[PDB]
Amino acid sequence: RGGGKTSQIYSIRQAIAKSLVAYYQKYVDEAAKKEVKEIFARYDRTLLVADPRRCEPKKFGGRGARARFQKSYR
Amino acid sequence: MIISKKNRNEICKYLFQEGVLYAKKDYNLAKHPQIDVPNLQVIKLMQSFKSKEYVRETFSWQHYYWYLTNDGIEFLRNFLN
Amino acid sequence: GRVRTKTVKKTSRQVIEKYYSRMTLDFHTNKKVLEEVSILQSKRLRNKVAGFTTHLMRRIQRGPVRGISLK
Amino acid sequence: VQHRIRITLSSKSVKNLEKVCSDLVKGAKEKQLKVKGPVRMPTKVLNITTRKSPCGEGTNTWDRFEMRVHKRVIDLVSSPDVVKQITSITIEPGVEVEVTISD
Amino acid sequence: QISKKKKFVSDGVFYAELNEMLTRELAEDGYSGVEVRVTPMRTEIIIRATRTQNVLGEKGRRIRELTSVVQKRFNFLENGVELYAEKVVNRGLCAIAQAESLRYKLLGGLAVRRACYGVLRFVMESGAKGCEVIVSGKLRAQRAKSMKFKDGYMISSGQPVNEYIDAAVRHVLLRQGVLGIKVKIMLDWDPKGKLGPTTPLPDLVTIHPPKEE
Amino acid sequence: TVKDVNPHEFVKAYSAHLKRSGKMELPEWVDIVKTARFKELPPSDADWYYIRAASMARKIYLRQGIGIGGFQKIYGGRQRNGSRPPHFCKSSGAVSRNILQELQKMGIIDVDPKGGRLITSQGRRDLDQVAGTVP
Amino acid sequence: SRVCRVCGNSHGLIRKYGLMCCRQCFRSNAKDIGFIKYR
RNA sequence: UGACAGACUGAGAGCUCUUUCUUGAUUCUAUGGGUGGUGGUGCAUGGCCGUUCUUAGUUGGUGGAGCGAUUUGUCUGGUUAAUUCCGUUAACGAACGAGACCUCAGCCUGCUAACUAGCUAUGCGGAGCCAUCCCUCCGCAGCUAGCUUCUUAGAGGGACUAUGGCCGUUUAGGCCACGGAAGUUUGAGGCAAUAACAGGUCUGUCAUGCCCUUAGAUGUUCUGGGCCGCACGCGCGCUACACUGAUGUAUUCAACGAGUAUAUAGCCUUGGCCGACAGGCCCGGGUAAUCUUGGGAAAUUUCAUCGUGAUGGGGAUAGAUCAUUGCAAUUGUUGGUCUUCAACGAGGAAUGCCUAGUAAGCGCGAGUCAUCAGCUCGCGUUGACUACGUCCCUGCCCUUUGUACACACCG
Ligand SMILES: [Mg+2]
Ligand SMILES: [Mg+2]
Ligand SMILES: [Mg+2]
Ligand SMILES: [Mg+2]
Ligand SMILES: [Mg+2]
Ligand SMILES: [Mg+2]
Ligand SMILES: [Mg+2]
Ligand SMILES: [Mg+2]
Ligand SMILES: [Mg+2]
Ligand SMILES: [Mg+2]
Ligand SMILES: [Mg+2]
Ligand SMILES: [Mg+2]
Ligand SMILES: [Mg+2]
Ligand SMILES: [Mg+2]
Ligand SMILES: [Mg+2]
Ligand SMILES: [Zn+2]
Numbered sequence A: 001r002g003g004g005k006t007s008q009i010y011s012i013r014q015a016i017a018k019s020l021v022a023y024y025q026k027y028v029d030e031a032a033k034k035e036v037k038e039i040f041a042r043y044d045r046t047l048l049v050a051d052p053r054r055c056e057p058k059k060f061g062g063r064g065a066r067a068r069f070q071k072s073y074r
Numbered sequence B: 001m002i003i004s005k006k007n008r009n010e011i012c013k014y015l016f017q018e019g020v021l022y023a024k025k026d027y028n029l030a031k032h033p034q035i036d037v038p039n040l041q042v043i044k045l046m047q048s049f050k051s052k053e054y055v056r057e058t059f060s061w062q063h064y065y066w067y068l069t070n071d072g073i074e075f076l077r078n079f080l081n
Numbered sequence C: 001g002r003v004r005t006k007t008v009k010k011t012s013r014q015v016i017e018k019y020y021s022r023m024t025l026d027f028h029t030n031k032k033v034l035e036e037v038s039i040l041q042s043k044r045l046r047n048k049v050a051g052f053t054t055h056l057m058r059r060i061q062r063g064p065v066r067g068i069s070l071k
Numbered sequence D: 001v002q003h004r005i006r007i008t009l010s011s012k013s014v015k016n017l018e019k020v021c022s023d024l025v026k027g028a029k030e031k032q033l034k035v036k037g038p039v040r041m042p043t044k045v046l047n048i049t050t051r052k053s054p055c056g057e058g059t060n061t062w063d064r065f066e067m068r069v070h071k072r073v074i075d076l077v078s079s080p081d082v083v084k085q086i087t088s089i090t091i092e093p094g095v096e097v098e099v100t101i102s103d
Numbered sequence E: 001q002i003s004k005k006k007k008f009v010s011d012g013v014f015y016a017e018l019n020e021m022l023t024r025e026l027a028e029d030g031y032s033g034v035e036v037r038v039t040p041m042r043t044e045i046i047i048r049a050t051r052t053q054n055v056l057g058e059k060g061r062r063i064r065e066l067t068s069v070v071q072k073r074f075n076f077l078e079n080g081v082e083l084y085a086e087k088v089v090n091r092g093l094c095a096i097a098q099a100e101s102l103r104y105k106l107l108g109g110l111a112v113r114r115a116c117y118g119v120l121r122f123v124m125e126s127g128a129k130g131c132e133v134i135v136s137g138k139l140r141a142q143r144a145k146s147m148k149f150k151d152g153y154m155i156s157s158g159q160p161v162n163e164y165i166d167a168a169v170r171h172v173l174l175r176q177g178v179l180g181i182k183v184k185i186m187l188d189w190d191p192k193g194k195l196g197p198t199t200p201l202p203d204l205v206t207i208h209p210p211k212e213e
Numbered sequence F: 001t002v003k004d005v006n007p008h009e010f011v012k013a014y015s016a017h018l019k020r021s022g023k024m025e026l027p028e029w030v031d032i033v034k035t036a037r038f039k040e041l042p043p044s045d046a047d048w049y050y051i052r053a054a055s056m057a058r059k060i061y062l063r064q065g066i067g068i069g070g071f072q073k074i075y076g077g078r079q080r081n082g083s084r085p086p087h088f089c090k091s092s093g094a095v096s097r098n099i100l101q102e103l104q105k106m107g108i109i110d111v112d113p114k115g116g117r118l119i120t121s122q123g124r125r126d127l128d129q130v131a132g133t134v135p
Numbered sequence G: 001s002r003v004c005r006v007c008g009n010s011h012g013l014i015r016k017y018g019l020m021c022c023r024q025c026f027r028s029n030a031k032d033i034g035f036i037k038y039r
Numbered sequence H: 001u002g003a004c005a006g007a008c009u010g011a012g013a014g015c016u017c018u019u020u021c022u023u024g025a026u027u028c029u030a031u032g033g034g035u036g037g038u039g040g041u042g043c044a045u046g047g048c049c050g051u052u053c054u055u056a057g058u059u060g061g062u063g064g065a066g067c068g069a070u071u072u073g074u075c076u077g078g079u080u081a082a083u084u085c086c087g088u089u090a091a092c093g094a095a096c097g098a099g100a101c102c103u104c105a106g107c108c109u110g111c112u113a114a115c116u117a118g119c120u121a122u123g124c125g126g127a128g129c130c131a132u133c134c135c136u137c138c139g140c141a142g143c144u145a146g147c148u149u150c151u152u153a154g155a156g157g158g159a160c161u162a163u164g165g166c167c168g169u170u171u172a173g174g175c176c177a178c179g180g181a182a183g184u185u186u187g188a189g190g191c192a193a194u195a196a197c198a199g200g201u202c203u204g205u206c207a208u209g210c211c212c213u214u215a216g217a218u219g220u221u222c223u224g225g226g227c228c229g230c231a232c233g234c235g236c237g238c239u240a241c242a243c244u245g246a247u248g249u250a251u252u253c254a255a256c257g258a259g260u261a262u263a264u265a266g267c268c269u270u271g272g273c274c275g276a277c278a279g280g281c282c283c284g285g286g287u288a289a290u291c292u293u294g295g296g297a298a299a300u301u302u303c304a305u306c307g308u309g310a311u312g313g314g315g316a317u318a319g320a321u322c323a324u325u326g327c328a329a330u331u332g333u334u335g336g337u338c339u340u341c342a343a344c345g346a347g348g349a350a351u352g353c354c355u356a357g358u359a360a361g362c363g364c365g366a367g368u369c370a371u372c373a374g375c376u377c378g379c380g381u382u383g384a385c386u387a388c389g390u391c392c393c394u395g396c397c398c399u400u401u402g403u404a405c406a407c408a409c410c411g
Helices: A006-027 A030-043 B005-018 B040-051 B070-077 C006-018 C027-037 C043-060 D014-030 D080-086 E004-025 E052-056 E061-073 E095-107 E112-125 E160-164 F007-020 F048-062 F068-074 F093-105 F121-132 G023-028
Strands: B020-022 B055-058 B065-068 D004-011 D034-051 D062-077 E033-039 E042-049 E081-087 E130-137 E145-152 E165-170 E180-186 F077-079 F087-089 F109-111 F117-119
Touching (some): B005 B020, B020 E061, B055 E004, B065 E061, C027 C043, D004 D014, E004 E033, E042 E052, E052 E061, E095 E112, E112 E130, E160 E165, F117 F121
Parallel strands (some): E042 E081
Antiparallel strands (some): D034 D062, E033 E042, F109 F117
């Protein structure tokens, strides 16, 4: 729910990865889930750790959160 | 100005009872809240009573609050009582 | 860009003056030590001063130290 | 005899508001009512953005003003006179309460 | 019936209207603020000022006048609202009170220096951690100038400004110009909250003494 | 079923299905309209009145209580105002109206009390069968 | 036909929430209305 | 004092006139004085705001030096985003600014709860089916939770360079590595010092001094026009110059917010119907996590159509006509429909903005608003190249030095 398109897909990725790890940890074995932990994290860390990036807000004096308006002297 | 004695009487009967009166700068209403008058007499007869300082006045940003004085109660008692 | 200001360092030295045997090396233990022995107005300043006092420990415990005086 | 009542309760300040929330919950639970709450309902953020200059000179500078209006709702199962037995305790400044009789 | 956003905005505006309007009436009494409290079947407005028998008048006639005019202007239910005019607990820390006090000392013709330090010494003897008075305008000369007078502690940036800085601005209607007054008072930490604000300024540490056993 | 079938091929299969599975009435303005104000040409396909209906079939399938305006909005798009900045523009009313009326006339969908359009059970049967008959 | 409640002028109004005050009067009285400026 | 009729004038302004009726001490006349002014003066000013100046800077008390303006403290050096700190020290001890502070965002399977939030299970229903049950997906309800992970919002917790290595007087710190959600104070803002400007604002203000005006008015109201005029020059922008595209189907994903008694349903408008559209009719819902909207946004994705052509790029211009807002649409308010199909081949000299969910692309909401959003402020969606530097250009801060400058090199 929510997001865009690629955001939702990467959220799928994270959700299924963490769901498999949590299911294994609580219902299989901690050493068993540790292999899943290492397979996932060796390829990438972003499967398991949320990404703290957000569209940071837009400030006055420009259209854009970091740019400004084109500036004229004469 | 033009005023009817009945207009000025419904002013005096109202002021004797209340002692305060508020106008509004919203002009051309023909019906002040709580009395019946075209809002020109409300502003300007109490302007006259301020000129005679029977009523002392605080302007309050086009809200025109007036509260009558013990001199003006004598003025109106000299009329109706 | 992490240099501690005087409100930090003065307080760290002053608290380490008085409370030595009652506070230790571990950062989190010093946090909770400082909770009962001082009143501050921000958890981040609390963490800041506790984290300065902890390496004040790690320097005192091995050699002598400047003005701060302990019986 | 035992009916269902709503109390809705809003404010501007969280620290003021939560004191009232704990107030009514304990007022009910001293007398063992069937309560559920205090449901916390998403904060309204009133906002007005204004050019802080009064004449329109100098670099364009805006300032963003905002109120935060906080909404709380609690359900009680008691008679309205039993409710008035509770809701005569002191009410903190600024908070508003709007008890209503529901289905 | 109205929405809550609108109700809260309207009550803010109503508060603004009283707090502004009462300035012409209670100027020569040290008006300092009003607080509007919501009470059952009744409406309460605590004006706070410096003279009860002058705000009340004689046998509470003037507060009758004002409560009636507020009644009638803001169309309350009759006997709904009435106003008590209670005394400020302390008068030397109310920036508004000082603003109109200096306004009267300065309309009276009192010299600028004597008046301004009359404000400063009074504020300090009233136990204020710090104060400044800024006067701007055409005093005794044509080209405008600012006389700034300071004393004691003072904070000006960050959040605790709203917490501690009691600041007012007023105009003076002396001939050949207008003379503006700014009065800033820094408050002291009274955790009881009766006089000074409860929460302390966030540049303070109080290491407690080591009680011994 | 239809949630298992690729969302495009189900539309194709059902578009052929409501061609060969009997027939109905059809307005005599279908080969004129643009189906939306921001469009520029009428649909390049001939049986667009049928692919449209196949799509709007599964809309009421997988969502309930949809009005005509909901379809106007769902079938709007980007309107290029010329030199103005482009915007979002809702689609046409009559085209969706006659799709819904046609499907109602076959009883696939029907107007619900409390408002909206909901599928019927035998329409559900039909959509599930045609979904199952796709690779 | 519409002005400030405060100054009664015809520009710079803030119609939103029904204030009926201009951008200047609004700031001048903003803090007592309650528009705490957290950011 | 108001007015019938007729002339006058748009005027259904009795303003004036022919006409005699009505009100009655309210007036009218004259002298003063005020009142009102988006009139002048921002070079008389208050306030507010901007800027100097986003940098780290500033001022006392006592003491030292100097006849004195003044200087020291406020620094040799190291370090830091920082007058940040270590330390040095005729200074000592302090006051602001920095930091600290507050707001938003990011972490919490930890706590408080939530039929105006949502899972989860079962109970039936509907449809697919080794159909008889099961299994998959939807619908509805509850004394279903020994439900709060998703949603909300409170209290809290969390980061401290804490841990390790190396450099550094092994001080201040820096660079690196594990861990961790977070190791440019974690990201972005709010607030923000002394001194100043003849910076802007007398057109925000019953804020204002002085002048001018004050009835035949620069006062107030109305009508019509004007602010939009166009040989032209400049500034911020929008649309493009296409194939990484346009067109036409199919596919489906947010966030920020918004919604006066608005009268006889009325601001957001769901739903049914008519219409190609535009937009109309009827039932209604919502003062709101309740109805709008669980925002069904676009870009993008997919399948075809156009195939290098000023073409189906482009939508400038102009004609015909239709409906809504409005008491009024003309110098077309706006929105449709058909047609008209311009320049524009990636833009000279020059110049601007930008270092991570950032630039850029894409849409939404709000402000204005009866209608008009190419603008401004917010919001999310997709999402990078480059660098992690230097004082070369433009500027800033400190120290030293030079000065015939002080309105200060525009000397
Ligand atoms: Mg100024
Ligand atoms: Mg000396
Ligand atoms: Mg000497
Ligand atoms: Mg000295
Ligand atoms: Mg910061
Ligand atoms: Mg100036
Ligand atoms: Mg006119
Ligand atoms: Mg113009
Ligand atoms: Mg611009
Ligand atoms: Mg085209
Ligand atoms: Mg708009
Ligand atoms: Mg504009
Ligand atoms: Mg440049
Ligand atoms: Mg010279
Ligand atoms: Mg030269
Ligand atoms: Zn205003």
